[PDB]
Amino acid sequence: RPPIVIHSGKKYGFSLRAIRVYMGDSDVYTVHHVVWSVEDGSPAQEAGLRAGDLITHINGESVLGLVHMDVVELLLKSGNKISLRTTALENTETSV
Known part of the structure; x- marks a missing residue:
């Protein structure tokens, strides 16, 4: 998949969380960066960034x-x- 290329001089217009992903019951984790929201009319929205996206790379660098x-x-x-x-x-969450 090609990278999403955003053109902002302002905020990109999204929020993200760092999720501590554990594999068991010890205090050991890999941090995962997940887009939680994208602002309407923002550079991020326009470029196709979506809530729920895991960001793996920023400017070619693994994050x-x-x-x-x-x-x-x-x-x-x-x-x-x-x-x-x-x-x-x-492409969506499920409400329960």
Whole structure:
């Protein structure tokens, strides 16, 4: 899949969470960066970034396993253009 290339001089217009993904009952995890929301009319929305996307790469650099604020910093220091590689399973959540 090609990277999403966003053109912003402002915020990109999305939010993300760092999810601590555990594999068992020990305090051991791989940090995963997941887009939680995208703002209407924003550069991120326009480019096709979607809530639920796992961001694997920022400007060609693997970000899987980096802590939240390291990824926030990469986003803050990027320019008007950013390239995001992402992957998603279901295109919606399920309400229960």
